[PDB]
Design a protein around this nucleic acid. Structure first.
Ligand code: K
Ligand code: K
Ligand code: K
Ligand code: K
Ligand code: K
Ligand code: K
Ligand code: K
Ligand code: K
Ligand code: K
Ligand code: K
Ligand code: K
Ligand code: K
Ligand code: K
Ligand code: K
Ligand code: K
Ligand code: K
Ligand code: K
Ligand code: K
Ligand code: K
Ligand code: K
Ligand code: K
Ligand code: K
Ligand code: K
Ligand code: K
Ligand code: K
Ligand code: K
Ligand code: K
Ligand code: K
Ligand code: K
Ligand code: K
Ligand code: K
Ligand code: K
Ligand code: K
Ligand code: MG
Ligand code: MG
Ligand code: MG
Ligand code: MG
Ligand code: MG
Ligand code: MG
Ligand code: MG
Ligand code: MG
Ligand code: MG
Ligand code: MG
Ligand code: MG
Ligand code: MG
Ligand code: MG
Ligand code: MG
Ligand code: MG
Ligand code: MG
Ligand code: MG
Ligand code: MG
Ligand code: MG
Ligand code: MG
Ligand code: MG
Ligand code: MG
Ligand code: MG
Ligand code: MG
Ligand code: MG
Ligand code: MG
Ligand code: MG
Ligand code: MG
Ligand code: MG
Ligand code: MG
Ligand code: MG
Ligand code: MG
Ligand code: MG
Ligand code: MG
Ligand code: MG
Ligand code: MG
Ligand code: MG
Ligand code: MG
Ligand code: MG
Ligand code: MG
Ligand code: MG
Ligand code: MG
Ligand code: MG
Ligand code: MG
Ligand code: MG
Ligand code: MG
Lengths: 101, 61
RNA sequence: UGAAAUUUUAGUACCUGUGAAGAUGCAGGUUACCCGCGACAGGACGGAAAGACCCCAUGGAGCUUUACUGUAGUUUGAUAU
RNA sequence: CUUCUAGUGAGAAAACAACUGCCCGUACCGUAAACCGACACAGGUAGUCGAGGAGAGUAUCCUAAGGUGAGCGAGCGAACU
RNA sequence: GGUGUAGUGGUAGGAGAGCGUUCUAAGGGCGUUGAAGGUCGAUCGUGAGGACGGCUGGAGCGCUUAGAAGUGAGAAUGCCGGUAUGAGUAGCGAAAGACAGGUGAGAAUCCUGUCCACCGUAUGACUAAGGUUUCCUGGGGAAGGCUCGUCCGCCCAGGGUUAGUCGGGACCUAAGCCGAGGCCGAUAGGCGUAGGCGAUGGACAACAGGUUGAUAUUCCUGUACCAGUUGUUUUUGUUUGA
RNA sequence: GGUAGCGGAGAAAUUCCAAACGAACUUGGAGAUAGCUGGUUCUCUCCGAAAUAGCUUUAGGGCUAGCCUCGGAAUUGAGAA
RNA sequence: GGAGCUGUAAGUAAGCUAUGAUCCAGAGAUUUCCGAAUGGGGGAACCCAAUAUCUUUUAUAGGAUAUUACUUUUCAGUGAAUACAUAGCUGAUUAGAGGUAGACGCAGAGAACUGAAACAUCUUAGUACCUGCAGGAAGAGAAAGAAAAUUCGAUUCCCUGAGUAGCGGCGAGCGAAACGGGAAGAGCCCAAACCAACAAGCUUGUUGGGGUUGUAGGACUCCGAUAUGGUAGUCUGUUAGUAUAGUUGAAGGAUUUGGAAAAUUCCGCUAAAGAGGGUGAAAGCCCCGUAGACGAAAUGCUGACAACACCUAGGAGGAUCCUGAGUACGGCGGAACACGAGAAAUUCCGUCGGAAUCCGCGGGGACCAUCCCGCAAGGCUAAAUACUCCCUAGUGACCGAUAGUGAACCAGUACCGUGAGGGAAAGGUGAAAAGCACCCCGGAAGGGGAGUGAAAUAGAUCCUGAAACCGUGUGCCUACAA
């Protein structure tokens, strides 16, 4: 996937549009990703998971990868990603600035 | 099988044609005869057609 | 606890008559308050089975014989071996 | 398996002690609710044992050992079958 | 287009002109401000049929012109599915159960007890086939059980079959079958000798008791037997040789 | 264990051959053939029969003609009353 | 290739991974047992062996490894009746068995219903089925041909000839070929004469040379050339390309509705990319892609280049020799040719008889003469052609869950049958499980709240939710009516 675990991304579509967060987990097979504090859901858990209250837990659910854009770390803006080989290493580059990653 | 050892003549099928031209399948056989012949220098009894023997070129040991 | 055959829709009487000539349903008349339960089997030409009887189809099948035409076998001759 | 020689033969036999002996089946039903009958089906299912009194008897009636009370019942006590 | 005159029942059937369905092309449109579809309405046309509203629905679909067809159903004892009628009707499949106590949300039906009753050349006890886990233990009551069910040959989870001697194989053969070579034969193959396979038969060494919830001539205790190996000892034979 | 469908087996009944045997069952030829029965789906407009002759292994089938429909040609107008 | 991964498949549990995992492609290792199954047996997936080596035990028992079917080829040894021999037997060696792709090809064997409005000749039809053999194609093929325009010059297949000529209870029906136009194209080897050698018994077999044909050729004899060209050969390399993973690949933000924007509105931008798919509704510019550019360690495939290899002679003479025999052909009986015995050629089978050979032989639809054309009884041969179980990439006025494969789903399954065999049903929550914590009635099931959600009358029998059918409520009517 053009996005990777731990990247800073911007949500471009969905109820959480314009939110930003770090990628907590990636699912290449599903082409989905989890962004902290994004797409939070209330889940009615039984107390069977070492939680002696069950309660209504809050957890981020995955969103489709195409609904996010990687944050240009040097500029802080969302950008599309090109692939340029630098020093013999294939790396991502911000099309808006040319910055790496 | 029942095959002429030298010419390969073998049973085939033919037709019986009555005066009314009714057709029924029949078997037509060659005139094979058991004959003691020298194959590769050793005598053996094999089926041979009278036609093959006719020329006299077939050994009759 | 819980089927089935049947079933065009039916608020599904009687007599005489009529009618594809034997009507619960048509005509005239008569009788009959509404809904059931236990019984009977006259009718619904009641159900079941596209009648086996009968006739027809230039249908089928099994069988018979001095039907027709063939034929396995059996036998006789010529001829080859 | 027992004998006979032919062959084969340098080891044999006895007692004693210790030791070795593989694979497959082994549950359960089996005159049945577990098998053959589409069913937890009044049918069918080879062989063995199969007691006592009266009795020729494994007949018959009632019983022993043993097994079982049958997988819808409670009333009523009409016709009809 | 107007007037006039005439005509306009109809099966087989001929002719003509149309409605609607799906799809293609082009153009022009409509749709989360709600498409198709469904439902209701007192709507329009001469007919097949066409709109427009309300509700439901949640993502595709009309219109015009032309094109192509799996293009229209009410009947075929039509096929498939669903649901009726008969009807809360037939039936609930040979026979004795009663009560007390217990269990449990719930008991004619499950457990325990007592009496009663039934089979007893069997409805008892063993086994072969067949079945193939139905066996035991602990749970369950959805479905199956012709009622009920706390229960079951059901469902769920664990567990259970111990052999030198029993039956079979490492033994033997019958019928029959396979069959090196071989014989015969359009092909395929058919037949068959040697040799094999093949029990329902022949041969063949262990019994008694005990033990588990479930195995027992299999495990355990006791006491055996059969085949063989090693070793100790004892006798006797080593080639006129057991 | 053996005998297998153009067959087997039959103390003989057309009797049995896997719950229908005058010729098993299954698959294929195969969508056998059926002058026979049933069925064949939207609408309106115009017109509208026949159930006869002849021949037919033909008689509830078929062919030509007669009767219906659609288009066309032409006439000294030939039709009807 | 570069960050997650330990399938479906959640859940735990335990782990792996920048020392590069998972994953993708090439190559290789392992690959139990049954199955042609092949050490023997057998009721498939099991049982029991022999030989040799090794292994466990003090030893027997036990375990592992290798070999051990049958037939065919070649060789060697042994070796009967029987003397030599041969047969048998043993060993070694050789290559077959079986399965397919329900297709295509060739061959052996070969129906019936049906049609003829009956039916036997005929038709269905040399079809279905069975069996054998195959190859990627097969079959055919290098004229004893087609013709008679005067000529053509192997075979195959397409168009046409033509529903013609014909065949036919002259019925029903069956039905060509040549010419002409195209696809594709390619021609070559032996036998024989004769020569050399070898071996035995002047010929007679083996070997090599020789030679290959119809305007006759060849031998043989003379001459002259030792070249010139070609190939349908090779796991021979070298080289290129290609197949099997891949890399790169442009351009959008806002505003309105909305749970969500790709929709609406406003301004932009890209295009060798406005194919397509996905993304919370309909996206050229968000993602995967597409246009385009680039890429292979390894292994195949193709093509070139080279190498090796194999073919490749002209002229003149005929004195003599050779040019495919139980053959061609004929009688009888069948069969194939569109041609059903017919006037019937031509081709083939069985049986019997049975030639010529260059002044020769065959054919030109009985047959004869003339003329023309050809040279059988030996072999091989690519391309055009047929088919698709499979693999890759796509297409569709093709289906859209009673349709489309029987099978969109754990389908040739469940189920049925002794067996061959027959053979189903069954797709859709939501954008995302966020799959209803907690409370209440109830033993549970199931409900009512409370929650999630845009929506729960989307609650898993889950999209929509028709009709039959069943029920609740009631505005009007109904107990003298056929
Ligand atoms: K009538
Ligand atoms: K009655
Ligand atoms: K009959
Ligand atoms: K046991
Ligand atoms: K007594
Ligand atoms: K007794
Ligand atoms: K009971
Ligand atoms: K009563
Ligand atoms: K009575
Ligand atoms: K509406
Ligand atoms: K119907
Ligand atoms: K019913
Ligand atoms: K009912
Ligand atoms: K229980
Ligand atoms: K034993
Ligand atoms: K026995
Ligand atoms: K009998
Ligand atoms: K085998
Ligand atoms: K195929
Ligand atoms: K026939
Ligand atoms: K007919
Ligand atoms: K060929
Ligand atoms: K034609
Ligand atoms: K005829
Ligand atoms: K040569
Ligand atoms: K997106
Ligand atoms: K798109
Ligand atoms: K390569
Ligand atoms: K002929
Ligand atoms: K000719
Ligand atoms: K010629
Ligand atoms: K819904
Ligand atoms: K009502
Ligand atoms: Mg009358
Ligand atoms: Mg009357
Ligand atoms: Mg009336
Ligand atoms: Mg009536
Ligand atoms: Mg009746
Ligand atoms: Mg009738
Ligand atoms: Mg037991
Ligand atoms: Mg019983
Ligand atoms: Mg008694
Ligand atoms: Mg009128
Ligand atoms: Mg539509
Ligand atoms: Mg239709
Ligand atoms: Mg219907
Ligand atoms: Mg009744
Ligand atoms: Mg009972
Ligand atoms: Mg008795
Ligand atoms: Mg039990
Ligand atoms: Mg229990
Ligand atoms: Mg019950
Ligand atoms: Mg024994
Ligand atoms: Mg045999
Ligand atoms: Mg043999
Ligand atoms: Mg014994
Ligand atoms: Mg027991
Ligand atoms: Mg009789
Ligand atoms: Mg019977
Ligand atoms: Mg046919
Ligand atoms: Mg009229
Ligand atoms: Mg690697
Ligand atoms: Mg074997
Ligand atoms: Mg006929
Ligand atoms: Mg091949
Ligand atoms: Mg891009
Ligand atoms: Mg836009
Ligand atoms: Mg012919
Ligand atoms: Mg002849
Ligand atoms: Mg000739
Ligand atoms: Mg010539
Ligand atoms: Mg070819
Ligand atoms: Mg289907
Ligand atoms: Mg549907
Ligand atoms: Mg189906
Ligand atoms: Mg709704
Ligand atoms: Mg629904
Ligand atoms: Mg009154
Ligand atoms: Mg009143």
């Amino acid at each position: 996937m053009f996005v990777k675990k731990g990247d800073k991304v911007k949500v471009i579509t969905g109820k959480d549009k314009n939110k930003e967060g770090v990628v907590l987990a990636a699912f290449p097979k599903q082409d989905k990703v989890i962004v902290e504090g994004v797409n939070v859901v209330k889940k009615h858990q039984k107390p069977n998971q070492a939680a002696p209250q069950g309660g209504i837990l809050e957890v981020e659910a995955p969103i489709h990868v195409s609904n996010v854009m990687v944050i240009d770390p040097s500029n802080g803006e969302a950008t599309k990603v090109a692939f340029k080989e630098v020093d013999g290493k294939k790396v991502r580059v911000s099309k808006k600035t040319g910055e790496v990653l | 099988a029942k095959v002429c050892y030298f010419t390969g003549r073998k049973t085939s099928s033919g037709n019986n044609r009555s005066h009314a031209m009714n057709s029924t399948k029949r078997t037509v056989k060659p005139n094979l005869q058991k004959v003691r012949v020298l194959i590769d220098g050793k005598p053996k009894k094999v089926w041979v057609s009278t036609r093959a023997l006719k020329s006299g070129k077939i050994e009759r040991v």
